[PDB]
Structures are given as C-alpha cells and as structure tokens.
C-alpha cells in the first residue's frame, strides 16, 4: 500500500509580509527503522525544477532563507514561512522518503498573493464570419482582471443552460495588479449555432453582488 | 555543487518509447541513487524509479512493466526508457539525485532529491503538425484573437508587432478533444482608441511555417 501524503490547504493566498503555514499528513508513520524521519519540502517556481528547502523534517538546505522552517513528527508535518516575500509565490510539496517503492509526494499547495476583491469586467464575443465557413462556431466569454480566482461561468443560448460544451483557461496572477483573467470557450457545430438566436454568458463572482450578463444575437 | 543536465525527445506518438538521458557533473557518480521523477497538472509529482552505480534498479509498481532505467559509468550518465506511451504519459520529466545508497549515507548525509535536472517537457499525441486558423474577437473595450486547431505547441502571439503590450492577456493553450491545441489572446484599450488606432494580432507557428497577421476591428 502506497503512502498517501495529504497537504493542506491546496491553495494559500497570503498577505505579503504575513506568516504562512502548510500542513502535510501521511497515512503511515514516517519514522524509519534507522530512527530518522524522512520528510522533505519543496518550492517550485514557474518553469523551474523543484527546489528542496527542508529535509528530514526540520533540516534546512544551505542557501535557503531562514524564514522557512519545518517541524512535526510521526504523521503530522508543517512547513512555516515567517514572512512571505514576493519570491515565495509558487508551488510547495512535501515528500516522504521512509516507505519505498515508491517515494510519494503531496498534491501541492499553491502560495499566491492575497489582495482585495475585484469584480471581473465581462465581455462576450460572437463567432467570426471567417470561422463559420469551416463548419464550426466558437463563442468566447472573457472575464478580465478579477480577484479572487474562484469564478463561475454559465453559457446561455436562447436562454438555455449548456453543459460540457466549453473549456476554461486562466492567466497566471498578474505581476503588477495581482488579478486573474479567464476565457470560456463555447464550442458549437455551426448547425446548433444558426438554429438559435440569442447568446449570453452569465458570470458569478465574489465581487459581484449579483450575476452580470453580456449578450448579443445573430 | 553537483549538477545534472538532461536531454531526449519530448514529442512522441502513442506506442513509442520515451528515451531520456541525464549526465552528471561536479560530484562523484557514486554514493546515491540516480532518480527519475515526473510532473503533470493532473497527477502532480510521481517517482518513476532509481538506479545505483552498480546497476541495481527499483521501480514504481504502477509503472514497473514499462520502465527501464540504466547507467553508463564510463560516461557518468543514466537513462530512462518508458515504453508503450499514451497521452496519459504527458508530463515534465526530471532526473534527480536520490538518497545515499547505503544505510550509513542515507542516515547521516543530507542527500535525497536535493539536486534536479532542468526537466524535459514530454507530450504524447497521435497528431501531425498543423497550423492554426486565426479568428478575430471583435468589440474601455476588449478585443482579441482566437487561435484554433494547431499542433505542436507553441504559437507566438503579439500585437501590432510588439508595439502593443499593455493590457494583453494570452491564455494558456488548451488541448482540444481533436488532439489539437487552441488558445485566445486579448487586449483592453480605451473605447476612444477604436476610431484612431488599428489593432493587428501577429500569430506565428514555426513548425508549419504559419504566419498570420489578423486585424481586429468593429
């Protein structure tokens, strides 16, 4: 039976300069027959390899800022960041090196920058006349510069809710304003597009006291 | 310090064998396990397997039937072969330095997933090279470009030949069910800039020699 490594939270928005705390529990004791406890923590910055910060629960790797510290024993472990700084945004993982094969990792915790709630400005875009010739149509819904990340889009075509005909994508958090943007893409087989008239996407976010809707028809 | 450099083809078709190699510099080739690890958005980080100086391997039980790991001591290199690949094997693959390869080194030395290769982005797909169709998303206003149905990654997207950079969000590519990628790029501009300024999205796809300059207008 593989050792399960459960991190918490999956997402951690931190105010800059404030402490941060990441939990990691294992489904089995991590204390090894040689007496050691084999638990490491990793930081991974975008487009880069994981970097080990902490090994054997509490030993800090050389060159690692002392604002990072690990602790715990047995099955309960904790990485702490005393003061979160700009360069600490990214993914953090625990790994157990006690029971193998296989070595197992936690599912990761994403440290992001907490800022104030910002409502998405919403824009809807109709299929192009150039695309309709290929026998398929794409309606795009844009949610621009919003915080926090958690958003909700629902597609309406002739005031009917859609299911499973759309894919979402999110930008990474903006470097200057700390916001997100999201695309929602409605995929239709043209015949289903001309069959109906009025198109609209309905966005639900924290920043909106009520769902905002953009629309068109043709 | 020890350093690891890796190479190998990352663009594969189903049923092919992934073949990666890692070269070791700046330290002894003995004392610790040479390790392969992979990372995908869905499954996170997964230990694939390890080998020692003497050629002794240990694999991940879920992969052991498709994994070979080998070592070439006369070159300080080690290799991964992952046979019969599918789309489920799409991931970034890393070589790393593992734990000490004896009880004493494991117990008393800091080694243990502390040095990593730069990674190899591996994509498995039955798709042949295809250039994108580029469609406008026409209109503080928002506008952009839908970049649809291309393979392989990446495309490059600019606006007005790099002159326009402010307010630009280019979303990450999504893999469509067709096995081809798609993304959108958008900008917001002042509404008064529509009658005075022209917007052009420049989309390049080097593999297919595709170069499209699509104007986006009311």
Numbering used by the authors:
A (entry chain B): 0 to 217
B (entry chain A): 1 to 139, 148 to 226
Publication excerpt:
Distinctive features of the interaction are a salt bridge between the CDR3H residue Arg107H and Glu16H from VH FR1, the insertion of the side chain of Tyr108H in a hydrophobic pocket, hydrogen bonds and van der Waals' contacts between residues Tyr109H, Tyr110H and Tyr111H and the surface of the CH1 domain. Next, we engineered and expressed in recombinant form two mutants of the CLL183 Fab designed to disrupt the intermolecular interactions observed in the crystal structures. Similar effects can be seen by the Gly31HGlu mutation in the heavy chain, since the germline-encoded Gly is present in the CLL183 receptor, while the mutated Glu is present in the CLL240 IG. Indeed, residue Lys214H, whose side chain in the IgG CH1 domain forms hydrogen bonds that stabilize the self-interaction, is not conserved in IgMs or IgEs.
Recently, a cell-autonomous model of CLL cell activation was demonstrated whereby BcR IGs from both stereotyped and non-stereotyped CLL cases could promote Ca2+ influx and nuclear factor-κB target gene transcription without the addition of exogenous antigen.
